[PDB]
């Protein structure tokens, strides 16, 4: 057995490899740097930074493995997870339709052979055996349980996941870390908020049309697109600080009275490192450390552990 665990989010897919080596490649898969393919040549494609394009295909859910706008993304982890297989996948897939959305994922790669061709004429065979899935949110808590980031004990865990679309928050309770279903739900409030906040910005003031992935990095650090030096941290301010309390306030509004049995609190995914501090006043000194590097991927992390432990 192979493990790898698997992430596939509206913005970044993610895995993790062999003796864990985290790969991540941008979600976007365009038709014609790899070509790969999943019918041994007939059909063709280019993922991740390399595709540019308008014929352009993207995920349209979090966590839809069973989704024909996936597999092209999955097909192309397996490729940079590095098989010298027989693999199981560790996955998620958010809590509010966790049930319908683990059936088709089981459908469309358990028991089934993944064959796909690269480069220089190559094949490669994984034979999926299982799938294991867990809720978003869930992947992230065992990790840090696992790594002693966070213990059991009375009380409820608030895993804030902030993604690229949506933002999406798990109330765990940490007895026995399960979690709390109607404590639990999704903002469709990302980071792509602050990137457009930002590229619609741009024109409004300085003129051109300031195109994603400047847009992106903008948010963290300055920029250049002919010869023109647009962006900057002193600026994102006035963004970031609307997109981190429209998340607060819109748990505020959901959490409410239940705010008081709440512990810890849990900061993960891509924007956390943005406004990821910022969600201590939800319920304070209930904060938990966790390494700016390992917010993207302490989902998967916990998909593939959770693989293990069966
Ligand atoms: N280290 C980084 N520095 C600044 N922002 C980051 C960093 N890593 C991720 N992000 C931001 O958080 C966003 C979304 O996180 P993520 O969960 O990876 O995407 P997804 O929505 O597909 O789950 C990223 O697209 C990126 O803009
Ligand atoms: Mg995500």
Redesign the pocket.
Known sequence: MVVVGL?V????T?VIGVDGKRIIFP?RWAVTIPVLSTDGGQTKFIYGKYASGNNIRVPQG?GRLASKEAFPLIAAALWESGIHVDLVIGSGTPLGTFDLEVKAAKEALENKVLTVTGPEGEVRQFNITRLIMRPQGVGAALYLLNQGIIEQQPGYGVVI??????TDVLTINLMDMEPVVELSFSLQI??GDA?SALSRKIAKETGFVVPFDLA?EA??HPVMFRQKQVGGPEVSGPILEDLANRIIENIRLNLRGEVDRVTSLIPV???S??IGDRFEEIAPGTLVKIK?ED??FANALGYRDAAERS
């Open positions: 992430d989010g509206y913005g970044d993610k979600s979090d996941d902030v993604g690229s679309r949506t990302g980071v990137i992106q948010l963290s995914g891509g924007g490192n943005l700016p917010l993207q």
